[PDB]
Design an enzyme around this catalytic site. Sequence first.
Site, short mmCIF file in Angstrom:
data_model
loop_
_atom_site.label_atom_id
_atom_site.label_comp_id
_atom_site.label_asym_id
_atom_site.label_seq_id
_atom_site.Cartn_x
_atom_site.Cartn_y
_atom_site.Cartn_z
N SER A 134 10.78 -6.87 78.78
CA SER A 134 10.28 -7.99 79.56
C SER A 134 8.92 -7.62 80.20
CB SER A 134 11.26 -8.36 80.67
OG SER A 134 11.35 -7.33 81.65
N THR A 139 11.25 -1.85 84.92
CA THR A 139 11.45 -0.98 83.78
C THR A 139 10.73 -1.56 82.55
OG1 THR A 139 13.52 -0.14 84.62
CG2 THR A 139 13.18 0.09 82.25
N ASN A 222 18.87 -15.39 73.95
CA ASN A 222 18.75 -14.21 73.11
C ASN A 222 19.16 -14.44 71.68
OD1 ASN A 222 17.86 -12.93 75.44
ND2 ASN A 222 19.73 -11.78 75.76
N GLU A 248 0.80 -4.88 56.32
CA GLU A 248 0.30 -6.14 55.77
C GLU A 248 0.32 -7.21 56.82
OE1 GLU A 248 1.94 -7.55 51.79
OE2 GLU A 248 2.71 -5.49 51.91
N1 LIG Z 1 14.95 -13.82 77.31
C1 LIG Z 1 15.50 -13.02 78.24
N2 LIG Z 1 14.84 -12.77 79.36
C2 LIG Z 1 15.48 -11.88 80.15
C3 LIG Z 1 16.69 -11.26 79.92
N3 LIG Z 1 17.01 -10.41 80.97
C4 LIG Z 1 16.00 -10.53 81.80
N4 LIG Z 1 15.04 -11.40 81.36
C5 LIG Z 1 13.81 -11.78 82.02
O1 LIG Z 1 13.09 -10.60 82.34
C6 LIG Z 1 12.60 -10.68 83.71
C7 LIG Z 1 13.29 -9.64 84.56
O2 LIG Z 1 13.11 -8.34 83.96
P1 LIG Z 1 14.39 -7.45 83.56
O3 LIG Z 1 14.36 -7.10 82.05
O4 LIG Z 1 15.68 -8.06 83.93
O5 LIG Z 1 14.04 -6.11 84.34
P2 LIG Z 1 14.21 -4.58 83.99
O6 LIG Z 1 13.49 -4.19 82.74
O7 LIG Z 1 15.66 -4.28 83.87
O8 LIG Z 1 13.60 -3.78 85.22
P3 LIG Z 1 14.25 -3.37 86.62
O9 LIG Z 1 13.44 -4.11 87.68
O10 LIG Z 1 14.18 -1.86 86.69
O11 LIG Z 1 15.74 -3.76 86.57
C8 LIG Z 1 12.82 -12.13 84.12
O12 LIG Z 1 11.72 -12.94 83.71
C9 LIG Z 1 14.07 -12.50 83.34
O13 LIG Z 1 14.24 -13.90 83.13
C10 LIG Z 1 17.39 -11.55 78.71
O14 LIG Z 1 18.45 -11.05 78.32
N5 LIG Z 1 16.71 -12.46 77.93
#
Ligand SMILES: Nc1nc2c(ncn2[C@@H]2O[C@H](COP(=O)(O)OP(=O)(O)OP(=O)(O)O)[C@@H](O)[C@H]2O)c(=O)[nH]1
EC number: 3.6.5.-
Lengths: 434, 428, 428, 429, 128
Positions: A134, A139, A222, A248
Amino acid sequence: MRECISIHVGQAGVQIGNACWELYCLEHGIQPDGQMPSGDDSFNTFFSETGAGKHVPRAVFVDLEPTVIDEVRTGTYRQLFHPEQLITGKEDAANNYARGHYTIGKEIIDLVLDRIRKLADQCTGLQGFLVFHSFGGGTGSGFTSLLMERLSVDYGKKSKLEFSIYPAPQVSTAVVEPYNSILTTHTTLEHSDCAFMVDNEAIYDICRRNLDIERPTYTNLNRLISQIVSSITASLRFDGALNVDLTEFQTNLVPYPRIHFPLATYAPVISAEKAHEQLSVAEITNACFEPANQMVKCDPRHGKYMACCLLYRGDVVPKDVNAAIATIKTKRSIQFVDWCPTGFKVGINYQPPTVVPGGDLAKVQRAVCMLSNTTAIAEAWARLDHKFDLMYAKRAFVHWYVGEGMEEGEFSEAREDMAALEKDYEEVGVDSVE
Amino acid sequence: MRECISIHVGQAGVQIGNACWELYCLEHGIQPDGQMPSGDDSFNTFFSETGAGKHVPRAVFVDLEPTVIDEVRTGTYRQLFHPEQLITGKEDAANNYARGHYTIGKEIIDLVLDRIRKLADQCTGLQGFLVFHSFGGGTGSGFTSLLMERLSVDYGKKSKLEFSIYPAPQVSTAVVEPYNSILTTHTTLEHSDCAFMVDNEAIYDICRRNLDIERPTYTNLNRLISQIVSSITASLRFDGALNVDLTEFQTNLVPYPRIHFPLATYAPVISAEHEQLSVAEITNACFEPANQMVKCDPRHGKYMACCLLYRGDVVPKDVNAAIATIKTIQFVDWCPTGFKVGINYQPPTVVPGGDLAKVQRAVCMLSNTTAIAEAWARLDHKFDLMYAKRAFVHWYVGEGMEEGEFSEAREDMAALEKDYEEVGVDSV
Amino acid sequence: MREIVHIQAGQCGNQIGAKFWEVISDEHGIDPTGSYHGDSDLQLERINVYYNEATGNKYVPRAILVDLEPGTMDSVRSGPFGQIFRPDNFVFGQSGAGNNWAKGHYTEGAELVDSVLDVVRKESESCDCLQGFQLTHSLGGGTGSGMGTLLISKIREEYPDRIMNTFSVMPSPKVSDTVVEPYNATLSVHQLVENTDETYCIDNEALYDICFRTLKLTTPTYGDLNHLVSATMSGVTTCLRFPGQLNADLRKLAVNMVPFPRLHFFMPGFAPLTSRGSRALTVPELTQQMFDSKNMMAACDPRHGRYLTVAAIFRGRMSMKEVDEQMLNVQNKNSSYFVEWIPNNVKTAVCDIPPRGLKMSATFIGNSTAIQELFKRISEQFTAMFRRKAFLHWYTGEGMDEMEFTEAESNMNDLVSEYQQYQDATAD
Amino acid sequence: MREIVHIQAGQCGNQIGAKFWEVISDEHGIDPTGSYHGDSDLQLERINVYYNEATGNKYVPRAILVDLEPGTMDSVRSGPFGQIFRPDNFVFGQSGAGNNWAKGHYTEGAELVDSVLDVVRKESESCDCLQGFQLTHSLGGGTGSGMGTLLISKIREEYPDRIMNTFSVMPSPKVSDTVVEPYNATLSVHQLVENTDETYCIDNEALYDICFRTLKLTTPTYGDLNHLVSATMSGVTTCLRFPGQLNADLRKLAVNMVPFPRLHFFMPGFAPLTSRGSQQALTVPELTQQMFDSKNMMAACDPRHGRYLTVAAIFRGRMSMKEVDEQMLNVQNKNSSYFVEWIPNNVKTAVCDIPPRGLKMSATFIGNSTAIQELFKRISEQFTAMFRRKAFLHWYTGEGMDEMEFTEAESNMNDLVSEYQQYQDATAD
Amino acid sequence: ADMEVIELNKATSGQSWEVILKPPSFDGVPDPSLEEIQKKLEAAEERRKYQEAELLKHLAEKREHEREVIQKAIEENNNFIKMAKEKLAQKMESNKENREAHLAAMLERLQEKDKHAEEVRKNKELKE
Ligand SMILES: Nc1nc2c(ncn2[C@@H]2O[C@H](COP(=O)(O)OP(=O)(O)OP(=O)(O)O)[C@@H](O)[C@H]2O)c(=O)[nH]1
Ligand SMILES: Nc1nc2c(ncn2[C@@H]2O[C@H](COP(=O)(O)OP(=O)(O)OP(=O)(O)O)[C@@H](O)[C@H]2O)c(=O)[nH]1
Ligand SMILES: Nc1nc2c(ncn2[C@@H]2O[C@H](COP(=O)(O)OP(=O)(O)O)[C@@H](O)[C@H]2O)c(=O)[nH]1
Ligand SMILES: Nc1nc2c(ncn2[C@@H]2O[C@H](COP(=O)(O)OP(=O)(O)O)[C@@H](O)[C@H]2O)c(=O)[nH]1
Ligand SMILES: C=C1Cc2cc(OC)c(OC)c(OC)c2-c2ccc(OC)c(=O)cc21
Ligand SMILES: C=C1Cc2cc(OC)c(OC)c(OC)c2-c2ccc(OC)c(=O)cc21
Ligand SMILES: [Mg+2]
Ligand SMILES: [Mg+2]
C-alpha cells in the site's frame, strides 16, 4: 528459467498476495497443500518444486506486525508456504513511513534480504521482482522503499515491478497516508521500473456498480484486484498464442524511466448473480477505453496515450484482435503523442479467467486487460500532492516523522520530486517542434 | 604431318567444341569410341592414334566450373577423350573477366599448360592452336587471355587462331559482357594471329529465318557454327590446296597484324524440312548480309582479302563464271581486286537429327573487310555508357584489377577503330 | 558455387523460413519425412543446392534455426514440415530479446552467437563448394534484426569470399508487434548496407496493402502476408533450384544486379497475386501485372524512380516468343523508367515448372532507385521518436551510445541520397 | 504493540480506575475472582492488552495502584472487584499529600516514586511487546496531580519509546475539594503538555452539569460523576480491547489524532447519557447527532466555538454500517465550518458489535478540538485570580518551591491556549 | 575479259587458284616475358590481399566495439549499485545522528528537572 519473485509488504500487500496465490493455484490446478494432481511447464516461473512433488510459491510475505501473516499461517493455504517465506516482526510502523523505513524496518531488513537471496539462488534466469504494497501504510510505504533501495544494491538493474495501493477515503484511510504516499513514491522512483497503481476508490466503485455490492469488503476488493494482477502475470505463467515476457512489457510501456506508471483497465466485470450473451473481442476491447472499468480514477479521454498493451485471455484469435484494434486506430477521440508511430503490444493466452468459488465475478469465455501509458495518470498524483500540501503548509503531523530521525528537508525534497514528475507528464504530452 | 591443337575455354568454347568434334568424327568416319573402320592421312592433324587403333582428338577442354565438361565426361563422346584432356575447377568466374584472369585462373593455369605440353610433345611439327571461347563469360574472356599470354611465352611465333563468340541480347547475355569483351580483346590482340568472331545475333537470325526455328537453342546455334568452323578447318584435315597450314590463314587474310578479324559468310543454309543451288547461286549468297557471321555492312566498307572455300560438287569453270558476274564490291587501293579460291571435294556432312539439309555443294567466304569495325563500335558504345558511371567496376577492382586497365583496354579499342579507318583511306 | 546454407532467425525469420521450406519441398517432391516421392528428374537435378543427402536416400534441408526464445523453435518443430529439419540445427536460448536490437546484437545474442557459428561451420565444411548464405529475418524485432545482423558480420569475418543474401522483412505500423520497430530497423539497415551482397526487401506495408486493397481481406493475418512471401521466395530462387537456361548462382546474380556495392536492396514483385484459398492468366497480363506498383513487395512506386537492373522470371508452359515480345514492349513503352547508361539491363528467364496452384506465374526482382521511399519512411518514423529520445533508455541500458543511433540514421540518409544520385544521372 | 500497563494515582485516580476495571471486566466476562465466565471468544481475543494470565487460567489486571494515603486503597481492596488486583501492585504511603501538588511532586511523592517504578518495571518486563502506559488521576489534588506527573516524567525517562496516555480529571468549583485546585491543575497541565502523548480531558465541570441539568440530580455524588467517566473510558478503549476492522494501538491513534505535539488534549463525548440506575433505544441518527452536541461533551467546552483538528467516533452495538457511514458523512457536510479544511479525511469512524452494559446502542466521541482552549482559559482565570494576591502560596513555598515555577507553568498554559487559537484561525486559503 | 586466272595448287582432296579481276589501284609500297607477366599477376594478388586485410581490420574494430558495449553495460550497472549503496549508507547514518540527538536532548531536559528537584528539596531544608 525466466523466474519471477513476488514480495508482499504490509497488510495490503499480504492480503492481496493471499488473493493472487489462491487464484494462481486454482488456475494451475495446485491444491492448498502444494500438490498438483497430473503439459504446460510455464507455471514454474512462479512455483518451485520439492523432491516430493510439492509446488511452492516463489514468494516472500513480510509485515512488521504478526496478525495478518498469522492468518496465512493458520489459514487454508498454510501448507503452501514454507515458514521461512512468511516473515513478521512484533511492532508495526504505526502508519509512519519513518518507522517502516528506519526505526522498525532496520531491525528486519537483513532477514528479509536473506530469504529473498535464498529464493534468487534457486533461479537459473531470474526475470525480476513483483512488489505488492500500500502507499498509505507505515510498512507498505516505509519498509517497501527501504527494501527497494537494498534490492537495487544486491541485484543492480534487475527489473522491479510494483503493484501499489493508492489511498481512498471510502476504503479505510488514515490521516497521514498522503505523507507516506509522497515519501515512498519519491524514494522508490529511481529503483522501480514499472508500477501499477490500484486506486481503492476505483475498485470500490467497480464492486458497487458492476458487482452490486452495497458495501465492499477487502475480500471483495482483493479478489477483483487479483483478477487484474493475474491478467498481467498470465503471460509469464502460461504458454499462449502470443506471449509477453517481463522485459517486453516494460520496453513497450515505459518511454522514459520516470514515466513508468501504466493505467490498467479490465473487461468484462460481470456479477455472478447477473442472469446474458457472451461479449465479443471487439466489445471487451472497446470497454478498455471506457472510464468505468479503470483501476485509477482519471480521464484518459483528455490526455495522450504513449503506449497500449492489450492482454487477452480465453477464447481469442489474432484476427479478431487486429480487427478490434483497427477500429480503435480510427478513433479521433483516442489521441497518441506525435512521437509514437505505433503504440500497440498484444498478448493472447488460451486459459480463460478463473472463478474462485464463492466469488462475486461471473464466469466469462474471454477477457482483456489493457495497460496504457497515458498522461492522464498524473491527475492521481495531483490529487495526492494537494492533500500533502494542505497538511504540510501547517507542518501537521510532521513531528511524528522528525521524531523518528527524518528531516523536514526530506518532505520538501520528496514533494519537489512529485512536482517534477507532474511537469514530466506535461512535457511528454506536448507536440514536437517542426 | 603438321598437327593442330584445339583449346576450348568456358561454357561456349566447350559446347561449340562438342559440336565441332562430333562433326569431324562424322566427316572422317570416326565412331564415338574413337574407332575408325577402314588413302587420305590428313585427319591426323586433328587426331592422334593409340596402340589399340583409337583416334583421339588433339584437344583440351577447360572450364572453371565442372557441370558443362561433366556432360562431355558422361555423354555420347565420353570415350573419345582421355580424362586428362578435360580440365575443370570448382567455381566459375561469375561473368567477371578479373575473376577468371587474376583470381581463379591463376589456380589452374599451370595444370592447363601441362596438359597442353603433353599434347605438344606428341607432335612432330605443331602448326599452332585453335582457341574457342566466348567474349562475354568470365572464363571465356578472362582465362582465355591469360592462356593466350602464356602460350606466346611457351610457344613463341607458333600460330594462334581464335573462334570467339560475340555477345547478343537475344542469346542469353549478361549486363557486364561488354566489359569482358573489351578487356579480353585488349589483352589477346597482340597474341592472336587471326580471329573469327561469331556474332550470336547473326547465328540466331539465320536459325530463325533459314531454318524456321522460332526460338533457337545453343544446340541449334552450335551445330550451325560447327558447319562454318568445319569449312574453315577442312583445308587442314583433308589433302587440299588452299589454307593448307595455319600460317596461310594469316598470309591470305591478314595483311596488317592488328586487322586480323575476317568476316565469314556461309551458303546454303537450308532447313531439313527444292532444287539444288548452282555454284553461281551459292557464290552470290556470299555477298548477302543475311548469311554473314557478324552483323555489319561490307557494302559500305572496303575489302582487303577474299577467300572462297567451296565444298562438294564444284568445278573451277563454274566458279570462274560466278566470279565473272560478281565483277560486274570495293577493295582498298593497295590490294588487288581478286579472290583466292579453294575447292574441297568432300561435300558438307550434316548431323542426323539436325536442322540442316544435305547439300551437294556449299561455300564459305572469308573476307577481311573494314565493315567488321562496326561490331567493335557497338560493343565500345555499350562499354562507354556503363563506364562513364563506373557501373559494376567495383566487381573487377575487388578481384585485384586496376581501374586503369579499363581505360587502357578502351584506348586500345579506340586505336583499333582508328586503324580500320586509316586502312580504308587512299595511299600516298 | 553449389551449396547454399540457410539461416532463419527470430519469430518472423523462422515463420517465413518454415513456409519457404514447405513450399520448395513440395516443388522438389520432398515429403515431411525427407523422402523423395516426385516423378520428374528435374526436381532432383539441383536439389543439392538446398538439401543434404542422408541415410536411406533422405533429403535434409541445410537450414539452421535460430531464436533467443524457445517458443518459436517448438512451433516450427510441430509445424507441417517440422520433422524434416536436422535436430542438431535448432539453436535456441531461453531469455528472449524483448524486441530490443541491442539485446539481440550486443547482450543475449552475443552469448548465443558462437553456438550458431559452430552449426554454420559444420554445415559449411560438408559442402563440396559453398556459394553462400541466405538469411530470413525481420528488421523490426530484436533477435532477427539484432542477432541476425550480428550473425551476418561474424559470418562475413569467417567467410569473406562468400555471398551473403538476405530476405529482410521491413516493419510497418499497419501490422506491428512493438513500438520500437523504427529504431531496430534503422540499426539493422545500417548493418545490411555494409555487410550483405544482396537483400530482398519484403515490406510488411506492401504485403498489408496487397491483402487489404487487392485481395480484399478486411483483416489480414501474418498467414495471409506470409503466403505472398513464400510465393516470392519460391520465385526469386527458381533459377538456383532448377536446371535449364543458365547455371545460376548467387555471385552471378549479384554481379549482374548490383552496379554499386551499397545499392543492393531489391524490390521483389509477383504475379498473379492470390489469397490462401483462391483463372488462366496470359503472357501480356503476367508482364503488365509484374511491373505494376500494386504487385510490388516493397511499398515504393517504381514510376517514382528508375530501374538500374531487372530480373524477371516466368514459370509455366508458355511461348518464349511471346515473353520476349512483351518484355521488349514494356522497355520500349516505359523507357523513362530504365536507366539508359546500363545497356540490356532487363533479363528474363523462363522455367517449365510452375509453382503449386498456378499454371503460370512471374517473379520480378528490381534494383530500383524508388526503394529510397522505403528507407525514407523508416527514417521519418525513426526521427519522430529519436528527436524526443523516446524509449532510448532500453538501448543505452544495454551499453549502446546515442552516437550509434546518429550514425545509423546518417548512413541510411546517405543510402537514400545515393539512390537519388543515380535517379538523376543521365547519359552524357 | 500489545500490552498496556495501567497506573491509578490518588483518590480520584483510584476511584475512577477501580470503576474502569469493574466495567471492562464485566465486558470481558471476568468475575471478581479473575475467572472467565463469558460466552463469546471475542471477549478473550485481545484480553492480553489489559490482563495478565495467571495459574488456574486466571486473569489479573496489569494495574498498579498508587497513593500517598492508605485510605482510598483500602476502600478499593474492599470494593466490588478489589480482590482481582495483584496484592504486590498496591504501593502506598502513610502521610498523604494534603491536596498539595508540591507534596506529591517534590516531597512525599518523591520518597515513594522509586517503589512504584519497581513494580512498573516488573509489569513491563513481563510484556511480550509493551505498547505504553495509561494513567488515571485528577489534576486538582496533590497525589494524582503532583505524584502522577512525577511518575510520568520518570516513566518517560526509562521508556522514552513508549506511548504515555492519561485520563486526567480537571477541577471545578462546582464539585471542588480545595481552594488551591487551580494551582495544582496549572502545575500539572504544564507537565502533561510536555510529557504525555495523548490526554483525555475529563472535566468535573462538564460531569456536574450533565448530572445536574440533563440527569436532573439535585445533589450529584462522585459515584454519579464516575458513572459518566467509566462509560467514556470503556468507549475510548473499545478499539484497543476488541477485535475489529481497526487493528488499534496507542501509537496509531496518536499519529492520526495529534497534528502538533503539544495539542494532544482530547474532548471526550458519549451518547446516550444515563444515570447509575440505568434503564431503556437510541437510533444511529440520534446517536450521531447527540454525540456531536455540546451537552454530551465530557469537557465543558462548546465545540461550535472552535474547529476539530481530528475526530474519532466509535459506535457500539448491532447496527447498520451503511447508516453509520451515511450519518457521519451528513454531519461533516452539514457542519463543514467546524472541521479544519487543511487536514483531509480528519473524521474516522469505527463500529464494534459488542455494546456496553445496560445499553443496546452507544457512541463514544474523541475530539481534538480547538474549543478545548475554553477549559484551559477557565483554569487560567482561576489561577491568576489567586496568584495575583499570592494566596495560599506558602503551602507550596513551604515545600521548597519558588514563585517563579508558578510563573512558568502559567506562561506555558497561556502559550497552549494561543496555539489552539492559532489553528482555529488558520485557513487553507 | 578483265580477269586473270592463276593456278595455285592441286591435291587428292581438292584444287586451289587465284582470280585477279583488276590489279591494285596504288601499285606501290603502302613479346612479354614470363617475369613481366608474373609481375602483373602478383601485383593484382597483393591488391586483392590488401583489400581483404582492410576489410578484416574493419571487422576487428567492430569486435572491439562490441566488447566495449558489454563492458560499458557492466560498468553502468556497477556505478548504479555503488551510488545506491553510498546514498543509502549516508541516509541511514543521517537518521542515526538525528534519532540520537533528539533522544539525547529529551533526556537532557529531564536531567535538568532532576537537578531542579534537588534544589527544591535543598530549599525546603534552608527554610527550617
Ligand atoms: N485494496 C486493499 N487496500 C488495503 C488492504 N489493506 C489495507 N489497505 C489500504 O492500505 C492503507 C493502509 O495501509 P496498510 O497496508 O493497512 O498498512 P501497513 O503496510 O500494514 O503498515 P502499518 O502502518 O505498519 O500497519 C489504506 O489505504 C487501506 O485502505 C487490502 O487488503 N486491500
Ligand atoms: N553460341 C553460343 N554461345 C554460348 C554458348 N554458351 C554460352 N554462350 C554465350 O557466351 C556468353 C556467356 O559466356 P559463357 O561461355 O557461358 O561463360 P564462361 O566462359 O563459362 O564463364 P563463367 O561462367 O563466367 O566463368 C553469352 O554471350 C552466351 O550467349 C554456346 O554453347 N553457344
Ligand atoms: N510478414 C511477417 N512479419 C512478421 C511475422 N511475425 C512477425 N513479423 C514482423 O516482425 C517484426 C517483429 O519481429 P519478430 O521477428 O517477431 O521478433 P524477433 O523474434 O525479435 O526477431 C514486426 O515488424 C512484425 O510485424 C510473420 O509471420 N510474417
Ligand atoms: N470525578 C471525580 N472527581 C474526583 C473524585 N475524587 C476527587 N475528585 C476530584 O479530584 C480533585 C481532588 O483530587 P484528589 O484525587 O481527591 O486528591 P489526591 O488524592 O491528592 O490525588 C478535585 O478536583 C475533586 O473534585 C472522584 O472519584 N471522581
Ligand atoms: C488508524 C487509526 C488508529 C486508531 C486507533 C484507535 O484506538 C486505539 C481509535 O479508537 C479511538 C481510532 O479511532 C477510531 C483510531 C484512529 C483515529 C482517527 C483517525 O483520524 C482522525 C484515523 O484516520 C485513524 C485511526
Ligand atoms: C546471368 C545472370 C544470373 C542470374 C541468376 C539468377 O538466379 C540466381 C536469376 O534469377 C533470379 C537471374 O535473373 C534471371 C540472373 C541474372 C539477372 C539479371 C541480369 O541483368 C539485369 C543478367 O544479365 C543476368 C543474370
Ligand atoms: Mg497494518
Ligand atoms: Mg561458366
